[PDB]
């Protein structure tokens, strides 16, 4: 139901505790289960090297081993084997996760199933850039938080996994100024509402047709994800009904305005979001800064209006 939904995603993510004997996996996501044929229950507590076998290149393995020992980032395309014995090429990107405390205790790796073959396009590099965006975005999130130390541990990592959602959706659009933002936002809103909402919540989407670069899209997607999620989660706490609206309008000078509007409960007056808040508010401010954008908010029992102004003209310069 959600297993298949969450699983169809192209990124696969794992986290290992390299401080523990034999560097056991402590977390894997649904994509990993689908890709490898192993259940999460089966895999946690074991070193990920069970995916390797006959055709696995020792050179690549050594480089992974060296990277872990040197607390370094590494990227290899490696031959791996699923639970049913099926071989596949795995494009692996990994390196130290960086806690609040230690900078090298935990490692994260991402896996992209590249199918079978027994090469580099121009799509390949665009795809690879995304896997860096994923890892990179994950790192910023992690460094703010404090990795706790089974199910509750998984919830700390289920949340992380959830935010990379804009980027997994982006990879899919990419597989098919090159990103159709309106189309992309439509899939973002649907996914979010699918996860974070239900029945009595109406989600409207009004996007102009415009193509933008990948980096801009990935950034925008994550920005909108945070803010749109906030709407469905918070705006109707004490409310029986509501409406959320996402807009994306191209204005003059290639200035793009992205809006998220509630009619719900309103942001508390003491709280000056996103300057004040939880991890989300911090995420939003970073993404806003990387975009060179401006965010504004208007409060009250008539609802919450969020507006992000993004300069598509200055992206080249940036
Ligand atoms: N649409 C909204 N309506 C009412 N209150 C809101 C709304 N959006 C945010 N808030 C308030 O702002 C606070 C900060 O939210 P935020 O920083 O995004 O973290 P969070 O939504 O609580 N969970 P997370 O964002 O995933 O870390 C929330 O706890 C709410 O009290
Ligand atoms: C987080 C993490 C994920 C890994 N994922 C893979 C993988 O998907 N495929 C693989 O062949 N090796 C993987 N390795 C390498 C493997 O587990 C082991 O550390 C090295 O092969 C050293 O023997 C991973 C290592 C870490 C730390
Ligand atoms: Mg939030």
Secondary-structure topology with pairs:
Blueprint: H1 3-7, E1 11-17, E2 25-28, H2 30-36, H3 40-43, H4 58-69, E3 74-81, E4 87-97, E5 106-113, H5 123-144, H6 151-163, H7 165-175, E6 179-180, H8 181-196, E7 201-207, E8 211-212, H9 214-234, E9 242-250, E10 255-262, H10 279-290, E11 294-298, E12 305-311
Parallel strand pairs: 7-9
Antiparallel strand pairs: 1-2, 1-5, 3-4, 4-5, 6-8, 9-10, 10-12, 11-12
Helix pairs in contact: 5-7, 7-9, 8-9, 9-10
The chain binds phosphoaminophosphonic acid-adenylate ester, riboflavin and magnesium ion.
Describe the structure.
It comes from Erythrobacter litoralis (strain HTCC2594). The modification Phosphohistidine is found at residue 132. Photosensitive kinase that is involved in increased bacterial virulence upon exposure to light. The modification S-4a-FMN cysteine is found at residue 48. It is an enzyme of class 2 (transferase). The PDB classes it as signaling protein. This protein has 318 residues and is α+β, with helices and mostly antiparallel strands. It folds into two domains: 1-176, Beta-Lactamase (2-Layer Sandwich), CATH 3.30.450; 177-318, Histidine kinase-like ATPase, C-terminal domain (Heat Shock Protein 90, 2-Layer Sandwich). 39% of the residues lie in helices and 25% in strands. The protein is built from ten helices and twelve strands. A five-stranded antiparallel sheet has the order 2-1-5-4-3, with helices on both faces. It has a five-stranded mixed sheet with strand order 7-9-10-12-11, with helices on one face. Strand 11 (294-298) and strand 12 form a beta hairpin. The longest helix is centred in the middle third of the chain and has 22 residues, at 123-144. The structure holds phosphoaminophosphonic acid-adenylate ester, riboflavin (RBF) and magnesium ion.
């Amino acid at each position: 139901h959600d297993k298949e939904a969450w699983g169809r995603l192209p990124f696969s993510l794992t986290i290992a505790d390299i401080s523990q004997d034999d560097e056991p996996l402590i977390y894997v996501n649904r994509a990993f289960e689908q890709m490898t044929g192993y259940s999460r229950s089966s895999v946690v507590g074991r070193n990920c090297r069970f995916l390797q076998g006959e055709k696995t290149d020792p050179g690549a393995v050594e480089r992974l081993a060296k990277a872990i020992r040197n607390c370094e980032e590494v990227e290899e395309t490696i031959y791996n084997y699923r639970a049913d014995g099926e071989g596949f090429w795995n494009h692996l990107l990994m390196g130290p996760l960086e806690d609040q405390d230690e900078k090298c205790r935990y490692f994260v790796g991402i896996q992209v199933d590249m199918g079978q073959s027994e090469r580099a396009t121009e799509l390949d590099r665009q795809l690879a850039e995304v896997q860096h965006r994923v890892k990179n975005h994950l790192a910023m999130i992690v460094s703010m938080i404090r990795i706790q130390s089974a199910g509750g541990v998984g919830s700390q990592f289920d949340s992380l996994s959830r935010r990379v959602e804009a980027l997994q959706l982006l990879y899919q659009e990419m597989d098919i100024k090159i990103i159709p933002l309106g189309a992309y936002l439509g899939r973002i809103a649907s996914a979010i509402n699918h996860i974070d909402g239900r029945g009595a919540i109406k989600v409207n989407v009004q996007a102009d047709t415009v193509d933008v670069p990948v980096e801009t899209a990935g950034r925008i997607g994550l920005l909108v994800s945070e803010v749109l999620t906030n709407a469905l989660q918070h705006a109707f706490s004490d409310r029986a009904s509501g409406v959320v609206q996402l807009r994306s309008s191209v204005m003059s000078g290639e200035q793009l305005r992205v809006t998220v509007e509630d009619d719900g409960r309103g942001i508390p007056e003491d709280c000056d979001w996103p300057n004040e808040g939880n991890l989300g508010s911090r995420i939003v401010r970073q993404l806003v800064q990387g975009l060179g954008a401006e965010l504004n908010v208007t409060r009250g029992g008539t609802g919450t209006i969020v507006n992000i102004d993004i300069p598509l003209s200055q992206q080249k310069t940036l």
